[PDB]
Paper text:
Nucleosomes block access to DNA methyltransferase, unless they are remodeled by DECREASE in DNA METHYLATION 1 (DDM1Lsh/HELLS), a Snf2-like master regulator of epigenetic inheritance. We show that DDM1 promotes replacement of histone variant H3.3 by H3.1. An N-terminal autoinhibitory domain inhibits, while a disulfide bond in the helicase domain supports activity. Here we show that DDM1 promotes DNA methylation by preferentially remodeling heterochromatic nucleosomes during S phase, when H3.1 and H2A are deposited, allowing DNA methylation of CG dinucleotides by the methyltransferase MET1.
A nucleosome core particle comprised of H2A.W, H2B, H3.3, H4, and 147 bp Widom 601 DNA was assembled with full-length DDM1. After iterative rounds of filtering, classification, and refining selected particle classes, a 3D reconstruction of the DDM1-nucleosome complex was obtained at 3.2 Å resolution. The final structure spans residues 200–435 of DDM1, including the DEXD ATPase domain, and residues 442–673, which include the helicase superfamily C-terminal (HELICc) domain. Like other Snf2 remodelers, DDM1 has two main lobes, each consisting of a parallel β-sheet core surrounded by short α-helices, connected by a flexible linker. DDM1 clasps the nucleosome on the outside of superhelical location −2 (SHL-2), making contact with both gyres as well as the histone octamer core. The helical structure of DNA was notably unwound where the upper gyre contacts the HELICc domain, and the DNA strands displaced about 7 Å toward the enzyme, while the other gyre shifts in the other direction compared to an unbound nucleosome, causing an opening between the two gyres. Surprisingly, a disulfide bond was observed in the HELICc domain, bridging C615 and C634. Intriguingly, the first allele of ddm1 to be discovered, ddm1-1, has a C615Y substitution predicted to specifically disrupt the S-S bond, and has strong defects in DNA methylation and DNA repair. The HELICc domain of DDM1 interacts with histones H3.3 and H4. The majority of the interface is formed by a loop in DDM1 (residues 480–487) that makes contact with H3 at the C-terminus of its α1 helix (residues 73–81).
Residue numbers in the entry:
A (entry chain P): 200 to 435, 442 to 673
B (entry chain E), C (entry chain F): 40 to 134
D (entry chain D): 53 to 148
E (entry chain C): 58 to 148
F (entry chain H): 24 to 102
G (entry chain G): 21 to 102
H (entry chain B): 22 to 127
I (entry chain A): 23 to 127
Amino acid sequence: GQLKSYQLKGVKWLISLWQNGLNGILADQMGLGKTIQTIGFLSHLKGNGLDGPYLVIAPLSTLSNWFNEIARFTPSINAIIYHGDKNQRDELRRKHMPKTVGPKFPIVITSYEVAMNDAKRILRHYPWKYVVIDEGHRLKNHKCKLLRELKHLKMDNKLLLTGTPLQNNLSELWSLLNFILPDIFTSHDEFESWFDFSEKNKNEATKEEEEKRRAQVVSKLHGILRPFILRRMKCDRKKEIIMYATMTDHQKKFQEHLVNNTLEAHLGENAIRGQGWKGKLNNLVIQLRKNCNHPDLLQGQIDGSYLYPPVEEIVGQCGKFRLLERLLVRLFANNHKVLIFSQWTKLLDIMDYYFSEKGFEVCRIDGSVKLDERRRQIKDFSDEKSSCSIFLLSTRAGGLGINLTAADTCILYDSDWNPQMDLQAMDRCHRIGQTKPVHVYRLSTAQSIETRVLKRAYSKLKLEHVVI
Amino acid sequence: RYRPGTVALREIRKYQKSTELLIRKLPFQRLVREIAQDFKTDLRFQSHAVLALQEAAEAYLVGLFEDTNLCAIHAKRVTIMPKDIQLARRIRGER
Amino acid sequence: RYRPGTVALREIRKYQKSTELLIRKLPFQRLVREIAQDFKTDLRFQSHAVLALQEAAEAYLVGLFEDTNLCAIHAKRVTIMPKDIQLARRIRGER
Amino acid sequence: KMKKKSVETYKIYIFKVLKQVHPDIGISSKAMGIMNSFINDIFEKLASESSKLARYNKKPTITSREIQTAVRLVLPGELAKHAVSEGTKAVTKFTS
Amino acid sequence: SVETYKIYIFKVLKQVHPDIGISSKAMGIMNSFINDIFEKLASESSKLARYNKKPTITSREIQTAVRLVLPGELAKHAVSEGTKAVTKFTS
Amino acid sequence: DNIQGITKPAIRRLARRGGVKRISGLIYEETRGVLKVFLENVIRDAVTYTEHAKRKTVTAMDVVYALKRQGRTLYGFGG
Amino acid sequence: VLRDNIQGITKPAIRRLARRGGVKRISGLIYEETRGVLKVFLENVIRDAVTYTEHAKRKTVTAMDVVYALKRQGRTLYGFGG
Amino acid sequence: KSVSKSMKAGLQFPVGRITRFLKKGRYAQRLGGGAPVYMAAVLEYLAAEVLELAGNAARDNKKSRIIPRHLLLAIRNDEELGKLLSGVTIAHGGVLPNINSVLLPK
Amino acid sequence: SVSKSMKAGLQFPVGRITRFLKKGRYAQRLGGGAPVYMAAVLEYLAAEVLELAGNAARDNKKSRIIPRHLLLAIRNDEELGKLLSGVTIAHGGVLPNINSVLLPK
DNA sequence: TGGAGAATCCCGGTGCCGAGGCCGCTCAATTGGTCGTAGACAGCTCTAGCACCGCTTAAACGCACGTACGCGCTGTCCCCCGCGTTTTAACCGCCAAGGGGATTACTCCCTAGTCTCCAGGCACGTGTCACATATATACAT
DNA sequence: ATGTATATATGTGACACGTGCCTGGAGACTAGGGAGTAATCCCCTTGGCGGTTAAAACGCGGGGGACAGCGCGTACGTGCGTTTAAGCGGTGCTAGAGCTGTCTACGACCAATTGAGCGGCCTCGGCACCGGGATTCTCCA
């Protein structure tokens, strides 16, 4: 068949876990490999003669993808998608569920927004045998408590599929385990026993010989969590360069001019009297990050109708922007294709203005447009005669999973606090089928605020050895 | 379809029996923050303060509109003019 | 002899620059005694109390007449009607 | 473990007078606040008027006649005459 | 005996204008005005002290009372003169 | 009658002080009624103040305090 | 990249506020006066509110300050605690 | 045993808390014997009248619970309370229904 | 000995403001410089009012202040007009004002 | 009067959550003594409103008269109202971390008393002035 | 053109100086207790994202108020002659407003109990929707 040996092993593991009657959490890395294995597992649990209904809960962007999968696997297997506008919702509430007992029951695919708004209806009239999730990243901060209401009725079996459960935040295993196995509640209420001095260390390799109880706690930490979590590797390229830039004297003058925050008296004479000031800065870290990235972002104090300084001198304010320009003019001789990843759209506007002056045409996903994305990709991009060379993306937004991956070089302008966002940013950056080397670059500044953020983010990422 | 003058009376009869909020909350708390920005810098606001301010503003505006309506009815008219509002504020001593 | 409208303006210009008493004192202190007779029996009044009452009454009446005049000018007229006084008292909240 | 600072409110007394007046009528939680605010406003006006009247007449004591005149001043119309009669009846029963 | 501000008002008038007199009917009005301002300021300060659960009247309470009662530019010009007097009294 | 003592030329002079050009012949009754109501409302509080202090004579201070209660402060007489 | 904050009081809201007060027909020149009067009223309340907040050595405005500021202007508001 | 100062007077409001509030506000140097009793009687009478009006207004509209709408209806339909509470606005109260005769179609 | 008003440079007395504040029992305790501040505010207000009244009386070619000049000084200022809007002065009169409609043409 | 499409409460079920009712403390409400100063009552003195009469002289009243403004009518124009499409922002969730007022503990110095005492605030007598009666020019019919 | 409102000469009841006495503001010792200081903890804040559903914007026809000009009638401003009562001076008279002097009784202050009022949990009936179903409301005819 289509599936390989490893998929069969995953199926057998699911059957063996159902043989013990335990609800399941699965953390396979390959996104497409989970859904076909789950569909085959349900088909094995459907053809045996069981009459239980099934609920699938996935994000809205992939529901029709599920409609492809049941189309691709077996045409005799049908399903319903309970996603519609309000007028037809009451039309489809009873369309395929005439009675609690019958020969045929449909398998229902819902969304997060359906299970959170007007979700009382589902419990009131009918029980469900299997409940399955498809993301597993929305149950950490214990904000969605309707799962308790779903728990009040007897849900026999729950399966939770997660991409990566390790964000290295406190009590993620607490929160996830209490949705799947709430039986042990008091055991986790104190985290000191699992916690060790090895977690809090300043070494680059994070291994200390002088500390005690590290090996026993690590061994028990993978040992108890090993039956609950299955993680499968495909086997049984990538080059990231982080380049730092030197700080110019003018931006440094702004830096030690706003440490003591004396900006109001200095620019009060320059500004017109009677206009006033927009407001004293509130938080330190976010404003420091804006200042480190570019001082022009801070120009909300002044008023102009898209009035920005000349492009010739805009280079002088930052060393990061100058280094990016040097890297880009070095990369035009390589005759390759670049992506620019950023976090704030105002920076994605300053950059857009800069390349609207440079004369190259760009393609951008900001999130202001709805359903124009596909048209943006098809037109002036992903074409042999497409003359666009610069593609602007926000890490928090959503781009299409393009197999072609015409863009081989990725540039991160600013870093993220959680490395998993960078992981999915690399996942979109390079995909299967291209042998092209992927020289990922990062623009950073030395001896600054973001160096602490980068160090804390890499220390956050470095806990992937302790879980399996 | 309908003759003009029926929907206005239906709206009058419907809006005078309901206890709700007619002005949206979010643009009002931004108008309140932008008005308070002029006097003191970096102020904070509880929700009950802006709700009370909204209630007071709606009560004041409904009273002013009732006085303006009485002033307009006094001059044998049906429409409302700014001069009626100016006269009502001059008589009430607000100006 | 004179055209109507000149003596009224002359009286307006003459009465607005003099500080005097326009109501007679003796009938006013009898109206005051006859109004106070209803509430308490065998009261006595100093002269300063009735003078202060007269001053307050004249100030109140001049303010009411100015408001009534403004209300009458609002309706494109020159004469004064009781309905203007009623409107001014209704807007001011005296009624 | 103190939840919050204790608050002095007339909820139970207002409920008792309501049950005395109407036998089968309840009250929502939003009207009790209004009633408490009304009672506290009347109390503050009466106390302020009595204090100012005591200050004006060069007297160092608050007696029943000062609050009598305060009720006659603050409460308008027929309410003033009907509040004096009930209040005087209570004072007579307290002394004797 | 009656306590009145006649002599002080006369002294401030002679300080302001060297050759202007005053009739006996304006002194009563001036005294009434001064006593009314005094009673408003004292009442506002007492009520403000009662509201904030504080048993003492300080210079900041009367500062805020002046900021509340006096409107417009008069409030800003009365604070500057009053603060200058307090500084000379302490030092 | 004591309410007829407020004659027509006095009302005309009071209107001319307020800046009125022409005057109709039906506003004297409303003026007398409003004056009567105002005097009743002041004299009620004045007599209450006089009766509080165990006196039988009405002084100027009672009238000043009664006017102060209604929000109309009067200067010149001592308060 | 911005809208004015006084334009946030739109025309249907003013129309609904007028219909609550019992108005049949409405002209097209009274929205500016309404916005100006609302602005002046909010300024006059917020001045006293900020004065009360600044008296108590605080930086957050509570409901009691707004209630006392409304009480100073003679408009007593019930329901919120004063 | 001991009896309270409100049970002997026949009142329903407490008497020692009115004394406590009067003493805590320093309105004067000395107080009287029957002043808190009088104040409590006046407050109880006012509360009884207001609750009578509100209960009648709520019972008229075929309801068994008092909401601020009924309070506003009871206040605004009485001359004495309308004079007492003219300048007071109630939260979530609304507006008294009134339509002028000119606006009515004919 | 020196007075508490001579050292502060004021013209109003300071021990009588203390005596009036103590005799009115506004609070339990007083402060050190509160009567000085109150006296300064009162002196400033009196100085401004007397400046306005003296200017108004000197404008009309007179050498003595009467209540008419006081009313003219109060009613011709925005700040004092807002301060003393609801106050009527005995033997004051009325500010002269004639509407433009009544004027003959 | 008579149809005709369209709002609008009335009578049913169907749940379901804030109101009404149980505990467990705890802290001011109420008794008993003891002290001390303010209110009540009694006289006593001077003053200032309440009648009351004659003079007289500005002002209110009454009555013609003649004209200007108020009110009803007609014609025209233009400007809000009502209804239908079409975008768009409020509302609701969710990161990711910090930070800042709402609350709780411990010391010192500014304000309250008592005790004296002497230049500065209120009552009684003098020189010296801003409005009353008579002569001269600039505007409305 | 012809008859009324504003500018200059000579005579008079309140103000700016002077004496006098007399309770209070200010200088000085001594208590004391309220205004100043560091540890927890839970709601705002800043720049983003995704997704839904009522709400606002624009346009277009149309009918019905706003407004200006016109004419008529009839109430109000102006002037002259006739009573009339207010303002004034002077007199007689007695209630009552302050003002001391003396007794006694009811509030302030402090120990010492002790049972109502303010938090927390159980347990459900009036109030919020769905869904027919009569019942009228305005717009043609």
